[PDB]
Amino acid sequence: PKCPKCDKEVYFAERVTSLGKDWHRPCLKCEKCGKTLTSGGHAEHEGKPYCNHPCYSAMFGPKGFGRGGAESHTFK
Ligand SMILES: [Zn+2]
Ligand SMILES: [Zn+2]
């Protein structure tokens, strides 16, 4: 029972489960959009949970040519 997110240990009633290891209830949050995540609607990058989409699919997932934004990001 140890948090992949923050690197603490995870007290029981403060827990959430994903990738067969636990987390902190607050922690499990998008590091893209900053939405607190739900019972199996997230997904994990290496020491950072996220949206299942788009945020996961966008930042950690194969993409097209190379038309990334200039300075302010968008639907890339
Ligand atoms: Zn945590
Ligand atoms: Zn998100």
UniProtKB/Swiss-Prot annotation:
Could you tell me the superkingdom of the organism this chain comes from? Eukaryota
* GO MF annotations, alphabetized: peptide binding; zinc ion binding
Domain named LIM zinc-binding: residues: 1-62
Q: Does the keyword Magnesium apply?
A: no
Locate the N6-acetyllysine modifications and list their residues.
Answer: K8, K21
Post-translational modification Omega-N-methylarginine, affected residues: R67
**Gene3D superfamilies per the UniProt record, alphabetical:** Cysteine Rich Protein
Q: Name one GO biological process term.
A: response to zinc ion
InterPro entries with a match to the protein in the record: Znf_LIM
Q: Return the GO cellular component terms, semicolon-separated.
A: cytoplasm
The record's listing under Pfam families reads: LIM (PF00412)
Tell me which UniProt keywords the record has, alphabetically.
Acetylation, LIM domain, Metal-binding, Methylation, Zinc
**Protein task:** Seems to have a role in zinc absorption and may function as an intracellular zinc transport protein.
Record-given protein name:
Cysteine-rich protein 1
Annotated organism of origin: Mus musculus (Mouse)
Supply the gene name: Crip1
